Amino acid sequence: KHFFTDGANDYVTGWENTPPLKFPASVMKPCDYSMTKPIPKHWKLRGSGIHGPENTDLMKLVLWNRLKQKRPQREVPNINYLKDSIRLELSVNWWLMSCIFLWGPWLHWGQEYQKVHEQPPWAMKRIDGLRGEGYFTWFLE
Amino acid sequence: GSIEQFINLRTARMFIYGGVSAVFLYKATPVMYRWEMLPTFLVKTEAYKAREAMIAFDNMKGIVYGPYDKGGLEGPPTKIPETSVGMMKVDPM
Amino acid sequence: YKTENPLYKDDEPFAKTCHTFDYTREGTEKNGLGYYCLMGLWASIFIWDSLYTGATMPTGVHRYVWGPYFPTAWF
Amino acid sequence: PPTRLSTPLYSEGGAFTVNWWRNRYGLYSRRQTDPMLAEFLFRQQVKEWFYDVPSYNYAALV
Amino acid sequence: GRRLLHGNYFTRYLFGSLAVIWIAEYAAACQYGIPRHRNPNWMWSWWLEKQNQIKNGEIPANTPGYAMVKWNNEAEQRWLKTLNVEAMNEEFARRREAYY
Amino acid sequence: ESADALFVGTLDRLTAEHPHTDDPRFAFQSNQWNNCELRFTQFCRCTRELGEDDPRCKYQYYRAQTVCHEFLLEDWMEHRHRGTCDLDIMPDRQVIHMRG
Amino acid sequence: ISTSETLNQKILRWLDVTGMLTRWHSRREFILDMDPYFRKNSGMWTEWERKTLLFLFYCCTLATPYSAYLDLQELKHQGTKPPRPVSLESRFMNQRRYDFTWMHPQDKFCSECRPVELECKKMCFDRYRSMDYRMYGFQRPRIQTYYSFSTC
Amino acid sequence: HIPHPVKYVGPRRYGRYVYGMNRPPVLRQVKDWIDWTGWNSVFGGFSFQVAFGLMIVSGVYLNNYRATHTLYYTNKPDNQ
Amino acid sequence: WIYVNERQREPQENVMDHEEFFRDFDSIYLGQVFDHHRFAEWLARRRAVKWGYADQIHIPPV
Amino acid sequence: VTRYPSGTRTIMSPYPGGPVYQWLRINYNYFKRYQWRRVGRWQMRSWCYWKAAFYGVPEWN
Numbered sequence: 001k002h003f004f005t006d007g008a009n010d011y012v013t014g015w016e017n018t019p020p021l022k023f024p025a026s027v028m029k030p031c032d033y034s035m036t037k038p039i040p041k042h043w044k045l046r047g048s049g050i051h052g053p054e055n056t057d058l059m060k061l062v063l064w065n066r067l068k069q070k071r072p073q074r075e076v077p078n079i080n081y082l083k084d085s086i087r088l089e090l091s092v093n094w095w096l097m098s099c100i101f102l103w104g105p106w107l108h109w110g111q112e113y114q115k116v117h118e119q120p121p122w123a124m125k126r127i128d129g130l131r132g133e134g135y136f137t138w139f140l141e
Numbered sequence: 142g143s144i145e146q147f148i149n150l151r152t153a154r155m156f157i158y159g160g161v162s163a164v165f166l167y168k169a170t171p172v173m174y175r176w177e178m179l180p181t182f183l184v185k186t187e188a189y190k191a192r193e194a195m196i197a198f199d200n201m202k203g204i205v206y207g208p209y210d211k212g213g214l215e216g217p218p219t220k221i222p223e224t225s226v227g228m229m230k231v232d233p234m
Numbered sequence: 235y236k237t238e239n240p241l242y243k244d245d246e247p248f249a250k251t252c253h254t255f256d257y258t259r260e261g262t263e264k265n266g267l268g269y270y271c272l273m274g275l276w277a278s279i280f281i282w283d284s285l286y287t288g289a290t291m292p293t294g295v296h297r298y299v300w301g302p303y304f305p306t307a308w309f
Numbered sequence: 310p311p312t313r314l315s316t317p318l319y320s321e322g323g324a325f326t327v328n329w330w331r332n333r334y335g336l337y338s339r340r341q342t343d344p345m346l347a348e349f350l351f352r353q354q355v356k357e358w359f360y361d362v363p364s365y366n367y368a369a370l371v
Numbered sequence: 372g373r374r375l376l377h378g379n380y381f382t383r384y385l386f387g388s389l390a391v392i393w394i395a396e397y398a399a400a401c402q403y404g405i406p407r408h409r410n411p412n413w414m415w416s417w418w419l420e421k422q423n424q425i426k427n428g429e430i431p432a433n434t435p436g437y438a439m440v441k442w443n444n445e446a447e448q449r450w451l452k453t454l455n456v457e458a459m460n461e462e463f464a465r466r467r468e469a470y471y
Numbered sequence: 472e473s474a475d476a477l478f479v480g481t482l483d484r485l486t487a488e489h490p491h492t493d494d495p496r497f498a499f500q501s502n503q504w505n506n507c508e509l510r511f512t513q514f515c516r517c518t519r520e521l522g523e524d525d526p527r528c529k530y531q532y533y534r535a536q537t538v539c540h541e542f543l544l545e546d547w548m549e550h551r552h553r554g555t556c557d558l559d560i561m562p563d564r565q566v567i568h569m570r571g
Numbered sequence: 572i573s574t575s576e577t578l579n580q581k582i583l584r585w586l587d588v589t590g591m592l593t594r595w596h597s598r599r600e601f602i603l604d605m606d607p608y609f610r611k612n613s614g615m616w617t618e619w620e621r622k623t624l625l626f627l628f629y630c631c632t633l634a635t636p637y638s639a640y641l642d643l644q645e646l647k648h649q650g651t652k653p654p655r656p657v658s659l660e661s662r663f664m665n666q667r668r669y670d671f672t673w674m675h676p677q678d679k680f681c682s683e684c685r686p687v688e689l690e691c692k693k694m695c696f697d698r699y700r701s702m703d704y705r706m707y708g709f710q711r712p713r714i715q716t717y718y719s720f721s722t723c
Numbered sequence: 724h725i726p727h728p729v730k731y732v733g734p735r736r737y738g739r740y741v742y743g744m745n746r747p748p749v750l751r752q753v754k755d756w757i758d759w760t761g762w763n764s765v766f767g768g769f770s771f772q773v774a775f776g777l778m779i780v781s782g783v784y785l786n787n788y789r790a791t792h793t794l795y796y797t798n799k800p801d802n803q
Numbered sequence: 804w805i806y807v808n809e810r811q812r813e814p815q816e817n818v819m820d821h822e823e824f825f826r827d828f829d830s831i832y833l834g835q836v837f838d839h840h841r842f843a844e845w846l847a848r849r850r851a852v853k854w855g856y857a858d859q860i861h862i863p864p865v
Numbered sequence: 866v867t868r869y870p871s872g873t874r875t876i877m878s879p880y881p882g883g884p885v886y887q888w889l890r891i892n893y894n895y896f897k898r899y900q901w902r903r904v905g906r907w908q909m910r911s912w913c914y915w916k917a918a919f920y921g922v923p924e925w926n
């Protein structure tokens with residue numbers, strides 16, 4: 001996508017909130033400890049307890065988000081992604097084709113008809129005696 | 142009987158398709174002629190000739206030297222200004 | 235060994251976490267039948283308004299078998 | 310309004326729901342950098358703006 | 372990869388809006404009983420009658436409209452002094468002969 | 472005679488019998504500029520058909536005065552006499568349908 | 572006429588005179604037509620991306636001649652634009668509160684003429700020339716100059 | 724978005740180009756190309772022009788031909 | 804360069820007499836589309852008459 | 866397999882082409898790579914608007 005979005009289309013830094021799905025959960029998992037079981041009372045708080053790099057998952061997320069920036073080969077995206085990347089480009093190109101091979105031919109026919117019959121082929125011939133081509137978009141009359 | 146020798150797939154496909162075409166052109170060509178869809182060089186419609194017969198390239202009237210006709214009986218100026226006479230740098234014939 | 239061409243693999247799913255993205259129930263992924271019904275009606279109104287130019291000026295004369303209070307007398 | 314991230318939030322289906330809002334709230338956000346933090350900030354905003362009774366009066370007026 | 376708008380938003384809201392505008396306009400016309408038949412001509416009755424006379428050959432072809440009114444402004448008096456419909460018709464006739 | 476005779480025949484008749492009342496075609500708006508322009512166009516078309524001396528066209532001018540301020544009429548009446556009034560150009564010399 | 576090739580091959584060869592088709596059907600030939608600095612990044616491209624790029628590029632370059640034809644016809648039309656009737660000066664036409672001088676606040680050339688009113692300026696320039704003041708333009712016949720688009 | 728599979732079901736490779744031998748018919752190739760690059764762009768791109776053209780040209784019958792036989796006060800000829 | 808190259812050329816005849824135009828509407832209004840080379844030559848001769856250089860130029864035959 | 870110089874031999878036909886064809890193909894290849902592209906390389910390297918913003922700035926140690 002063209003526009004940059006910190007959450008989804010973050011191409012400036014390449015940050016990703018979660019690790020790749022390819023990695024086993026034992027190797028790397030999304031940072032989610034909401035399901036942690038209640039802490040036993042006899043356990044004592046050693047660390048700060050503050051959300052941050054003391055948590056293993058968050059640490060691995062930061063580490064991977066920096067070490068993923070160098071890779072031996074490309075991670076080929078599927079054709080669906082590639083189509084979306086240039087959706088506007090392809091659509092504009094087809095619009096140009098339509099303007100040349102659809103709009104072009106009937107516009108030429110209308111002008112040639114206008115030459116002989118004074119008004120385009122999609123207009124009501126007048127009887128008022130006024131001269132000239134008149135309107136072109138008949139449905140906006 | 143005795144036509145079966147001719148009746149054949151290729152002889153049929155060129156008979157239905159070709160005949161369908163024979164009627165498509167015979168029925169569509171007059172419409173194209175009426176609606177000015179045929180190429181001009183191939184043929185000119187009577188309406189085309191009627192309009193073209195009204196066109197000439199020898200009218201040398203109506204030369205004016207002002208942007209507006211402000212009514213009246215005098216009308217727009219029709220005489221070239223003296224200061225403009227002989228002001229053109231025309232190459233030698 | 236066996237491999238899969240990456241160009242024809244399926245899109246990766248959203249991760250399942252406390253913060254999960256789900257578009258399945260929105261129904262905003264593509265235009266539905268209703269949208270195409272709007273297009274059909276637009277084409278129909280466009281053609282009708284031009285073909286039958288006296289429709290907006292109807293005739294007040296009405297016979298109506300089974301009188302006016304029968305259901306087929308309202309359409 | 311739940312206070313634990315383990316307890317899910319109910320969402321209807323449609324184009325204006327809790328799930329629809331979650332998908333788009335953090336699109337431009339630099340602060341929702343991981344699931345735990347993203348959910349906490351999302352619920353913080355939802356609690357503050359959508360669970361505020363008087364806010365619904367302005368929705369009617371607009 | 373996360374989506375913010377409708378998957379087909381541009382076509383949806385463009386064609387969709389046009390459709391709603393067209394349909395609403397038809398409904399509005401029906402409620403007010405507006406005539407829906409397009410007329411491309413002027414409605415000046417006396418003028419349209421003069422034009423029929425030209426088409427019927429009662430008034431000579433290419434006769435100007437100011438050659439037919441019962442009041443002429445100054446600029447049309449100027450034009451009437453140089454108007455020769457008969458000469459104009461002969462010139463057109465000559466052109467047709469040359470073309471054919 | 473008929474009670475609805477004014478509406479019958481034309482919408483013009485209504486103000487012709489009641490000159491100082493609202494015209495049906497412009498009563499919805501306080502601004503009466505468009506009303507003045509229609510009334511002047513109607514005076515211009517009357518003279519073309521009947522001449523200036525006709526009592527009808529003289530009254531069509533009184534009707535125009537009822538809605539048109541004098542400073543506008545004097546200016547528009549000069550343009551008409553010269554032959555530059557756009558509301559009085561004969562229809563076959565109009566350019567409205569040319570080049571578009 | 573060569574008979575060592577089929578008719579289709581001959582047509583395609585001639586359409587490949589500039590190598591467009593060869594670069595489409597050969598990745599190696601496309602990458603070796605890139606300048607070395609950009610060839611370094613070529614190995615990452617997918618074949619989908621490569622041919623789609625060529626398709627967009629080829630469609631654009633093949634339509635430029637058509638736009639060029641349309642533009643030439645436009646220039647010819649403007650070069651021989653038909654005369655139009657002189658405008659009658661209507662109720663609200665040609666209203667002026669002050670002279671036209673915004674283009675030349677100090678010199679005030681052609682105060683009576685409008686900014687792009689070429690015929691008024693020509694006669695105004697002629698007056699200045701008759702007054703010993705040189706002005707540029709409006710002196711060469713159109714058919715005796717290049718790029719006029721008014722020649723038969 | 725909603726993750727979905729690649730919908731292209733056509734041939735993934737024609738083989739090496741050898742002087743244009745053993746290749747599909749031209750029209751088949753055109754169809755495969757649009758399948759490979761997506762029909763959504765084709766429909767989206769051409770939609771605007773198709774709509775405008777259909778409406779304008781439809782006036783040839785709806786606005787011109789029909790109209791010639793629409794005016795109910797025209798079929799009547801004077802002095803008949 | 805576009806401006807300078809155009810400024811040198813004499814102005815085209817934008818307008819003609821209102822009356823004379825409508826007395827020969829078809830020829831003038833439609834002459835260009837039917838035959839552009841002869842219409843171009845006709846225009847050139849009118850420019851030569853409007854600016855008084857007709858006897859100083861030889862207009863090429865069409 | 867014989868490898869020809871890039872851009873000099875067509876792959877669309879077994880026939881290399883006639884003299885005029887070969888001349889056109891070879892010379893367009895030369896003109897693009899060694900004549901036309903002189904302008905592009907000159908503009909890209911010698912007249913970069915972004916290189917000019919860092920002109921006179923100390924090196925990054």
Ligand SMILES: CCCCCCCCCCCCCCCCCC(=O)OC[C@H](COP(=O)([O-])OCC(O)COP(=O)([O-])OC[C@@H](COC(=O)CCCCCCCCCCCCCCCCC)OC(=O)CCCCCCCCCCCCCCCCC)OC(=O)CCCCCCCCCCCCCCCCC
Binds near residue numbers: 273276383763767775
């Ligand atoms: C026996 C039979 C008898 C006769 C029966 C006759 C029956 C009737 C026949 C007529 C047909 C009736 C059909 C009714 C049902 C239709 C259902 C249907 O399929 O409709 C949907 C169909 C397509 O809608 P869709 O399904 O949503 O599209 C699917 C897409 O593939 C979804 O994919 P997507 O959304 O991803 O699409 C690609 C998209 C991807 O885009 C994006 O990713 C989003 C980007 C958004 C932001 C863009 C940024 C700004 C643009 C940048 C690029 C600019 C390039 C151009 C620059 C130009 C510079 C000058 O790209 C775009 O679309 C936009 C970008 C491409 C370039 C845009 C160019 C400018 C467009 C705006 C101007 C348009 C007006 C131009 C006018 C001319 C020029 C002035 O629409 C229509 O067919 C139109 C409406 C049809 C119904 C109304 C018809 C009324 C008139 C009927 C008259 C018929 C004749 C009657 C005769 C009667 C005689 C008695």
Ligand SMILES: CCCCCCCCCCCCCCCCCC(=O)OC[C@H](COP(=O)([O-])OCC[N+](C)(C)C)OC(=O)CCCCCCCCCCCCCCCCC
Binds near residue numbers: 100101622736757759
């Ligand atoms: C008349 C005035 C205008 C004149 C100028 C017109 C300019 C536009 C011309 C565009 C031409 C684009 C050429 C692309 C390059 C093709 C190269 C090639 O040989 O490819 C072989 C290749 C060989 O296939 P392949 O090997 O790439 O296969 C890829 C791999 N698989 C098999 C998986 C798909 O095939 C093709 O030809 C593919 C491209 C087809 C593109 C067709 C585009 C049509 C454009 C015209 C639209 C007309 C619209 C008319 C109205 C329609 C109404 C709905």
Ligand SMILES: CCCCCCCC/C=C/CCCCCCCC(=O)OC[C@H](COP(=O)(O)OCCN)OC(=O)CCCCCCC/C=C/CCCCCCCC
Binds near residue numbers: 100101103104106107
């Ligand atoms: C057994 C089944 C057989 C079916 C056969 C179907 C045949 C269909 C043939 C369709 C032909 C269409 C021809 C259209 C020609 C248009 C020419 C034209 O107008 O050119 C000029 C015009 C621009 O003119 P201007 O002067 O600029 O004026 C307009 C803008 N101011 O140029 C254009 O429009 C450029 C585009 C031209 C497109 C030509 C389209 C040709 C289509 C051929 C289709 C053949 C299909 C064959 C199918 C066979 C199936 C077995």
Ligand SMILES: CCCCCCCCCCCCCCCC(=O)OC[C@H](COP(=O)(O)O)OC(=O)CCCCCCCCCCCCCCC
Binds near residue numbers: 268271386387394
């Ligand atoms: C600022 C101005 C903007 C432009 C103008 C705005 C106009 C108003 C807003 C329109 C916006 C539309 C966007 C497109 C939405 C869309 O396509 O929305 C599409 C939806 C369907 O959604 P799906 O795509 O999910 O099926 O369409 C519908 O809900 C309608 C289905 C078809 C109904 C057919 C019958 C309709 C009968 C109507 C009768 C009306 C009678 C009126 C009497 C008075």
Ligand SMILES: CCCCCCCCCCCCCCCC(=O)OC[C@H](COP(=O)(O)O)OC(=O)CCCCCCCCCCCCCCC
Binds near residue numbers: 369370
């Ligand atoms: C910011 C907070 C906003 C909260 C919402 C405020 C809504 C206020 C609506 C008040 C409407 C009162 C007038 C009704 C019409 C009337 O009397 O109108 C009177 C007329 C004529 O009546 P009679 O001819 O019988 O005298 O009624 C009709 O002709 C038909 C009326 C149909 C009304 C339908 C549309 C309105 C629907 C409103 C639904 C919600 C109502 C909520 C009320 C609190």
